[PDB]
């Protein structure tokens, strides 16, 4: 992924190195678009926001009163 | 050296008083400001809540200490008079108590401390008045801007362009120009699910939470109506004592059934003889407000019925409409009826809301109702919550005209002013005034801390900037620094700051005067 | 170890504040994440859920594992309720949300110890999210590889 960002501003490359992920069966790095490992956009946008919003709710607690 | 021994040690009580009260104030302190921190509270019933509302925190804090609980009454008085600043007045009280503790350690008698603090408080009030930017309650734009600004911290801020002028008209209906003290308890907020936020009305009459007749044939709407308040229940006789009836034939049971029906009808007919068009029946848990059968009979009489009306709603009806409570059935008479041009139930996405409008009578009184609509509970709740704050902000502008910049601006200015004015004082008063001025800094200090800013840096920048500015320099969480309080629209009504100075001083006075506690049973 | 003996704030209860409650919150969110963590991915392992009566079930469903977890700290319940909301909008991802949320809270606690104010941690996290979402839009693609080639065959 670092390589895919290095060429990004120039669009000069032999390979994009982009969208390479974890092959959890063979234990290697593969091109996920061809391999077929896809998730819908909404899953990643919602997951990142959902995790943050809960984190903020907890980080905002600097006091607990226990009656 | 050596000094008075004081074998009896009332100072142990005064120490416990300040220690307990400051602990409460330091706790709530962390919630000050739009960037303040939330608290978790587990209540005695096992329910756990998260909130940054100052009053809710203190209410559920379950304070036991006989003196620290005074800070709850302080937040109540602040909410009662100003409606805002319920956190700030408690924080200031804590800081002034800390100043008192240092003064006590220096050998200053608590009588001296209380009297000197009161004198400094009187100067703080004058300084606040000097800093005021005057407004008129005849200028709706000044009031709308003040309300919308305070609502910027709410979940839905966009509709304040409509909710704010509704609050203004609601107050002005009861706050005619030649007035000072405005009682917002004459403005009733009635909400139902359905519709959207824009679908909100300011009504010159009384709006109820209850529905009209459910039974077939009911008119559900009356024109040119006389309106009575029923406090008795229209239900078949059901004695609470012992009764023994023997029934050997159906004819006897039919007579019993006729008694139940005739009783309900006899009341319905006696009511109609009073020329009453609408029956607004007070809720009771003893018997049903109106039996289904009574609604049938009353419907046939072309009488509109609204059942199970809350006690508070009855108090609004008896003030607005000219109608009077009717304790009993035989006492139901024309003299007890009010006036309205139209009484109707409005069904807006199932709102089923009853409105009494158009009193058109000398018995009319300046009562206000608001009709709140919205698809979800959160919509009508946020609308109600926003209007409650908007009404309080506007009330403040009527009682003590003008706004003062927020962000700690008056706290820096007052502290600087008193620090210099103290130079004209002599003796214990000069030293105590300096401690008072220092205590004021707890607010801009806390705001800087909760905003993520360096405490000393922010307070220092404000103190130096107030060499040239007066109210224009304060803390902006939006800009995350010391910036122009007016361009950022950081404004607080005079009454809120004035009340915080007064009530905090009164609390410290009350706390320092406590030298003992005894049981009485 | 446990936060008690407050000896401050004269109310009918205890007071836990500052680094004490912050560390407690970290322990709670890790305790929850440590349960669901291993369910992530098609190659993960399932876990056993045993009730108070004597029955049990074995599942790798993150939503079931989290919902049926006995959580005694509200700091962890927030993440369990989050997952329950996730099911109502997406229907999946409950495992990955809890895993990320716990790591962010742990990382945040380290920033607090290094004298970064929680307000600036919350702010920075939200600023990062805005750019993170914009980035996702750049790697975003539509239905591809159907003309002149097929990758959908690897899905089947």
- Spatial neighbors of B221 by CB under 8 A, at least 6 apart, are B212, B304, B342, B343, B344, B345
H-run or E-run covering B8: none
Report how far residue C17's alpha carbon sits from residue B150's, in angstroms, rounded to the nearest whole number.
29
**Do C15 and B64 lie within an 8 Å CB cutoff?**
no
Across the A:B interface, residue pairs with CB atoms under 8 Å apart total 34
Report residue B345 as tokens. Answer: 């139930």
Report how far residue C24's alpha carbon sits from residue B234's, in angstroms, rounded to the nearest whole number.
59
Report how far residue B312's alpha carbon sits from residue B185's, in angstroms, rounded to the nearest whole number.
11
Report how far residue C92's alpha carbon sits from residue C98's, in angstroms, rounded to the nearest whole number.
12
Q: Does B69 touch chain C (CB under 8 A)?
A: no
**Do A60 and B37 lie within an 8 Å CB cutoff?**
yes
* Nearest-by-Cβ selection for C15 from A49, A60, A63: A63
Residue of chain C nearest A19, judged by CA positions: C139
Contact B34, B464 (CB under 8 A): no
Q: How far is C61 from chain A (nearest CA, A)?
A: 17
Residue of chain A nearest C75, judged by CA positions: A58
Nearest to B234 by CA among B213, B252, B250: B213
**Do B451 and C119 lie within an 8 Å CB cutoff?**
yes
Contact B164, B155 (CB under 8 A): no
Q: How was this structure determined?
A: cryo-EM
Q: Could you identify the residue written with the tokens 């035989």?
A: B330
DSSP-based three-state secondary structure for A30:
strand
Q: Which of B27, B39, B65, B452 to mutate to test the interface with C (most CBs of C within 10 A)?
A: B452
**Do C11 and B42 lie within an 8 Å CB cutoff?**
no
Contact B406, B492 (CB under 8 A): yes
Contact B331, B321 (CB under 8 A): no
DSSP-based three-state secondary structure for B494:
helix
Concerning whether B87 is annotated as a catalytic residue, the answer is yes
Contact B57, B51 (CB under 8 A): yes
Report how far residue B212's alpha carbon sits from residue B228's, in angstroms, rounded to the nearest whole number.
15
Annotated catalytic residue, options B53, B199, B204, B288: B53
Report residue C136 as tokens. Answer: 């996702």
User: B484 phi and psi, to 5 degrees?
Assistant: -80, 115
Report how far residue C138's alpha carbon sits from residue A47's, in angstroms, rounded to the nearest whole number.
17
- Burial of residue C147 (CB within 10 Å: 0-12, 13-18, 19+) is exposed
Residue of chain B nearest C118, judged by CA positions: B452
Q: How far is CA B181 from CA B176, B310, B402, B506, in A?
A: 11, 27, 15, 21
**Do B50 and A57 lie within an 8 Å CB cutoff?**
yes
Which of B 43-62 lie inside 8 A of A, CB atoms?
43-44, 50, 60-62
DSSP-based three-state secondary structure for B514:
coil
Report residue C82 as tokens. Answer: 């989050």
H-run or E-run covering C26: helix C19-36
Centroid of chain to Cα B316: 17
Nearest to B433 by CA among B419, B444, B443, B445: B419
Report how far residue B11's alpha carbon sits from residue B110's, in angstroms, rounded to the nearest whole number.
10
Annotated catalytic residue, options B149, B186, B200, B389: B389
Report residue B52 as tokens. Answer: 């940054």
| Superfamily in which the B203-399 domain is placed by CATH | GroEL (3.50.7.10)
Report residue A17 as tokens. Answer: 């190195």
Annotated catalytic residue, options B30, B84, B87, B149: B87
Give chain A's contact residues with B (Cβ, < 8 Å).
Answer: 57, 60-67
DSSP-based three-state secondary structure for B68:
coil
**Do A62 and B30 lie within an 8 Å CB cutoff?**
yes
DSSP-based three-state secondary structure for B336:
helix
**Bridge partners of residue B476, in order along the sequence:** B481
Contact B186, B176 (CB under 8 A): no
Q: B415's torsion region: left (phi>0), alpha (psi -120 to 50) or beta?
A: alpha
Nearest to B273 by CA among B224, B226, B241: B226
- Half-sphere exposure (CA, 13 Å, Cβ side) for B141? 0
Report residue A51 as tokens. Answer: 């995790």
Report how far residue B262's alpha carbon sits from residue B236's, in angstroms, rounded to the nearest whole number.
9
Counting every residue, how long is chain A?
67
**Do C118 and B37 lie within an 8 Å CB cutoff?**
yes
| Chain C residues inside the 8 Å CB shell of B20 | 9-10
| Chain A residues inside the 8 Å CB shell of B38 | 57, 60-61
| Chain A residues inside the 8 Å CB shell of C121 | 59
- Burial of residue B94 (CB within 10 Å: 0-12, 13-18, 19+) is buried
DSSP B133-171: B---TT-HHHHHHHHHHHGGGSS--TTHHHHHHHHHHHH
Which chains contact A through at least 3 pairs of Cβ atoms less than 8 Å apart?
Answer: B, C
Beta strand segments in B278-348, E: 278-282, 304-309, 325-326, 338-346
* Nearest-by-Cβ selection for B64 from C11, C119, C123: C11
Report how far residue B103's alpha carbon sits from residue B116's, in angstroms, rounded to the nearest whole number.
11
Q: Could you identify the residue written with the tokens 């009527």?
A: B398
Beta strand segments in B314-469, E: 325-326, 338-346, 353-357, 368-374, 403-405
Report residue B75 as tokens. Answer: 């937040």
**Do A63 and B30 lie within an 8 Å CB cutoff?**
yes
Q: Could you identify the residue written with the tokens 């009187």?
A: B122
Contact B368, B202 (CB under 8 A): yes
- Listed resolution, Å: 3.9
**Bridge partners of residue C57, in order along the sequence:** C49
Biggest CA pair distance of chain A: 65
DSSP B519: -
Report residue B168 as tokens. Answer: 């203004």
**Bridge partners of residue B403, in order along the sequence:** B133, B493
DSSP C90: T
Contact B32, B85 (CB under 8 A): no
* Nearest-by-Cβ selection for C9 from B23, B451, B452: B23
Q: Could you identify the residue written with the tokens 């690897």?
A: C154
Counting every residue, how long is chain C?
156
- Spatial neighbors of B473 by CB under 8 A, at least 6 apart, are B409, B412, B462, B465, B466, B482, B483, B484, B485
Report how far residue B291's alpha carbon sits from residue B288's, in angstroms, rounded to the nearest whole number.
6
**Do A55 and C41 lie within an 8 Å CB cutoff?**
no
User: B135 phi and psi, to 5 degrees?
Assistant: -130, 165
Report how far residue B178's alpha carbon sits from residue B161's, in angstroms, rounded to the nearest whole number.
27
Helices C118-139 and C94-113: crossing angle in degrees, nearest 10, is 140
Report residue B62 as tokens. Answer: 């379950």
Report residue B322 as tokens. Answer: 């000219």
């Amino acid at each position: 992924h670092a390589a895919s960002q290095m060429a990004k501003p120039e669009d000069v490359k032999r390979r994009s190195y982009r969208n390479y992920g974890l092959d959890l069966i063979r234990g290697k790095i593969v091109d996920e678009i061809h391999a077929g490992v896809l998730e819908p956009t909404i899953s990643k946008v919602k997951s990142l926001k959902s995790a943050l919003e809960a984190c903020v709710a907890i980080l905002r607690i600097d006091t607990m009163i226990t009656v | 050296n050596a000094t008075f021994k004081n074998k009896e040690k009332p100072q142990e009580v005064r120490k416990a008083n300040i220690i307990a009260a400051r602990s409460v104030a330091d706790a709530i302190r962390t919630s000050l400001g739009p960037k303040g921190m939330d608290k978790m509270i587990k209540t005695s019933r096992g329910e756990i809540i998260i909130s940054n509302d100052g009053h809710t925190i203190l209410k559920q804090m379950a304070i036991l200490h006989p003196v620290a609980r005074m800070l709850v009454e302080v937040s109540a008085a602040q909410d009662s008079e100003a409606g805002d600043g319920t956190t700030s007045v408690v924080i200031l009280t804590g800081a002034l108590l800390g100043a008192a503790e240092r003064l006590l350690n220096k050998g200053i008698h608590p009588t001296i401390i209380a009297d000197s603090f009161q004198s400094a408080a009187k100067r703080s009030v004058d300084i606040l008045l000097e800093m005021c930017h005057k407004v008129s309650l005849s200028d709706r734009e000044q009031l709308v801007r003040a309300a919308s600004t305070s609502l910027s911290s709410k979940i839905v801020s966009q509709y304040s362009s409509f909710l704010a002028p509704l609050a203004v008209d609601s107050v002005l209906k009861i706050s005619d120009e030649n007035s000072k003290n405005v009682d917002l308890n004459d403005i009733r907020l009635v909400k139902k699910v359905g519709g959207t936020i824009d679908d909100t009305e300011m009504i010159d009459g009384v709006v109820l939470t209850q529905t009209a007749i459910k039974s077939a044939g009911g008119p559900t709407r009356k024109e040119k109506a006389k309106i009575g308040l029923i406090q008795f229940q229209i239900s078949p006789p059901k004695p609470d004592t012992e009764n023994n009836i023997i029934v050997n034939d159906y004819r006897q049971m039919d007579k019993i059934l006729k008694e139940e029906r005739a009783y309900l009808l006899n009341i319905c007919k006696k009511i109609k003889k009073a020329k009453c068009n609408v029956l607004l029946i007070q809720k009771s848990i003893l018997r049903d407000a109106v039996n289904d059968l009574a609604l049938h009979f009353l419907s046939k009489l072309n009488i509109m019925v609204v059942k199970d009306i809350e006690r508070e709603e009855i108090e609004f009806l008896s003030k607005g409409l000219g109608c009077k409570p009717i304790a009993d059935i035989e006492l139901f008479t024309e003299d007890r009826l009010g006036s309205a041009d139209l009484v109707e139930e409005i069904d807006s996405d199932g709102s089923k809301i009853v409105r009494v409008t158009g009193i058109r009578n000398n018995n009319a009184r300046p009562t206000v109702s608001v009709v709140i609509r919205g698809a979800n509970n959160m919509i009508i709740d946020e609308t109600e919550r926003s209007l409650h704050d908007a009404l309080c902000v506007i009330r403040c502008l009527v009682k003590e005209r003008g706004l003062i910049a927020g962000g700690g601006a008056p706290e820096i200015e007052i502290s600087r002013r008193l620090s210099k004015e103290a130079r004209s004082m002599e003796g214990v008063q000069a030293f105590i005034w300096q401690e008072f001025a220092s205590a004021l800094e707890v607010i801009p200090t806390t705001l800087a801390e909760n905003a993520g800013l360096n405490s000393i840096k922010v307070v220092t920048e404000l103190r130096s900037k107030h060499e040239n500015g007066e109210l224009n320099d304060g803390i902006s969480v939006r800009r995350s620094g010391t910036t122009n309080t007016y361009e950022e629209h950081i404004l607080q009504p005079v009454l809120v700051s004035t009340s915080a100075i007064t009530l905090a001083s009164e609390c410290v006075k009350s706390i320092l005067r406590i030298d003992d506690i005894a049981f009485s049973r | 170890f446990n936060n008690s003996r407050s000896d401050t704030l004269f109310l009918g209860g205890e007071k836990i504040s500052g680094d004490d409650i912050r560390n407690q919150n970290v322990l709670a969110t890790m305790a929850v994440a440590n349960v669901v963590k291993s369910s992530l991915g098609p190659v993960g392992l399932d876990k056993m859920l045993v009730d108070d009566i004597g029955d049990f079930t074995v599942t790798n469903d993150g939503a079931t594992i989290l919902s049926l977890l006995d959580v005694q700290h509200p700091a962890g319940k927030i993440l369990v309720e989050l997952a329950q909301q996730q099911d109502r909008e997406i229907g999946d991802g409950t495992t990955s949300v809890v895993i990320i949320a716990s790591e962010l809270l742990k990382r945040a606690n380290e920033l607090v110890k290094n004298k970064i104010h929680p307000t600036t941690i919350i702010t920075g996290f939200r600023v990062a999210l805005r750019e993170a979402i914009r980035f996702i839009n750049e790697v975003l693609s539509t239905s591809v590889d159907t003309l002149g080639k097929e990758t959908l065959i690897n899905i089947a």
